[PDB]
Amino acid sequence: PTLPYYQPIPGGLNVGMSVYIQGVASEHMKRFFVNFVVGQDPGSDVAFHFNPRFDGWDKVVFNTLQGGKWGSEERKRSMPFKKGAAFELVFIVLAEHYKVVVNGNPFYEYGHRLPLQMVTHLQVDGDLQLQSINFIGG
Numbered sequence: 001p002t003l004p005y006y007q008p009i010p011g012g013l014n015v016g017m018s019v020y021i022q023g024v025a026s027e028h029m030k031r032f033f034v035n036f037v038v039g040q041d042p043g044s045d046v047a048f049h050f051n052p053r054f055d056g057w058d059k060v061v062f063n064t065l066q067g068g069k070w071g072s073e074e075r076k077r078s079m080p081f082k083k084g085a086a087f088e089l090v091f092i093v094l095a096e097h098y099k100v101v102v103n104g105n106p107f108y109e110y111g112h113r114l115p116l117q118m119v120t121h122l123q124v125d126g127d128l129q130l131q132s133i134n135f136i137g138g
């Protein structure tokens with residue numbers, strides 16, 4: 001796949017589905033993001049924004065964008081990615097949350113703030129190369 005990536009999720013999200021992303025973090029990475037989007041047009045709500053950042057004390061930010069407004073960020077001050085390194089990034093869609101798994105290691109559970117049933121698109125962009133995106137268990 002080429003970046004930016006912004007594609008419909010086949011059949012939408014359902015509990016039990018996984019999004020499996022294989023990529024390589026840029027040697028000079030500052031950030032990248034994965035968005036679960038309600039729609040495809042500019043201004044669309046983002047049910048789940050997953051945002052690793054290497055600026056400062058390395059961390060991953062998690063949030064939701066609704067009606068043009070970012071909600072209260074969640075943050076985990078641990079960085080499972082590495083500049084220049086390949087990664088395997090998995091989002092397991094469960095009833096209560098998105099379960100994030102990185103390189104086989106469970107990393108975070110982000111509670112749903114918008115209904116998973118209303119997510120239509122996946123958007124990926126930033127300082128990485130994308131090798132593949134697969135939807136499993138749809």
Ligand SMILES: C[C@@H]1O[C@@H](O[C@H]2[C@H](O[C@H]3[C@H](O)[C@@H](O)[C@H](O)O[C@@H]3CO)O[C@H](CO)[C@H](O)[C@@H]2O)[C@@H](O)[C@H](O)[C@@H]1O
Pocket residue numbers: 049051061062063070073
């Ligand atoms: C640093 C910021 O990066 C972009 O905006 C992102 C937004 O930044 C938050 C920041 O994470 C938070 O700690 C602070 O309290 O408010 C900032 C402004 O909203 O965070 C959201 C997720 O919460 C997205 O990642 C945004 O891209 C940029 O647009 C800002 O100008 C600023 O440089």
